[PDB]
Write a protein that binds this ligand. Structure first.
Ligand SMILES: CCCCCCCCCCCCCCCCCCCCCC(=O)O[C@@H](CO)COC(=O)CCCCCCCCCCCCC
Lengths: 108, 108
């Protein structure tokens, strides 16, 4: 009977553009060519379903002492890309989890 | 001014063994040998450093109504695996974040 403190939505997605590990925005190839056959590029993306499952932020948080919200953390997936017209293999930034972050309130 | 609810540790790693997408334990290659160019397989994994970063469980949790602990979640990354003579690409699992899990009482 377990709950996560923030709700997530995971799916397989394709991207046309992404941002690599170092920051460059880069075109992500529709297809890739390995072992004389073509494959599409898919990515397992996990986003936040919303930033406040509970009206007071993350779930099960002590609201009296903590303000909170849920936001995503990234992973880095190797993919075939292109910056300008130079094609290269790079690690690109895919959202991989939905995590709660807290701000010690003495104000909000 | 902000804090994580559970802490995490990330690094780029090599894998000799790995759990596949269908549940099987499989062995990852040393190198991917493309066009007579060869590349090791690097994976970005994030783990928790602590199932409970605070005595109460996860940080900021209303411990009075909720029990809590932080655990890894998995992403799915294509790696080149082998069993003996037969190499194949398969989605293996990689720990990508530390999330807080809660159980006790309220719901909503
Ligand atoms: C069913 C079988 C079908 C297979 C087709 C796949 C379809 C799925 C979609 C996904 C597509 C991906 C396919 C992958 C195919 C592999 C091709 C091999 C080519 C190798 C080239 C390569 O490996 O890519 C490398 C560039 O050659 C990049 O490797 C890096 O140089 C090494 C790691 C360095 C990390 C540096 C960061 C340090 C910062 C500290 C950490 C803080 C972080 C914030």
């Amino acid at each position: 009977g377990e709950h996560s403190v923030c709700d997530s939505v995971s799916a397989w997605v394709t991207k046309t553009t992404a941002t690599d590990i170092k920051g460059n925005t880069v075109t992500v190839m529709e297809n890739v060519n390995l072992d004389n056959k073509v494959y599409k590029e898919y990515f397992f993306e996990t986003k936040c379903k919303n930033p406040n499952p509970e009206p007071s932020g993350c779930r099960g948080i002590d609201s009296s002492h903590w303000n909170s919200y849920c936001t995503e953390t990234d992973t880095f997936i190797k993919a075939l890309t292109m910056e300008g017209n130079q094609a290269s293999w790079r690690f690109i930034r895919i959202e991989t989890a939905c995590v709660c972050v807290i701000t010690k309130k003495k104000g909000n």
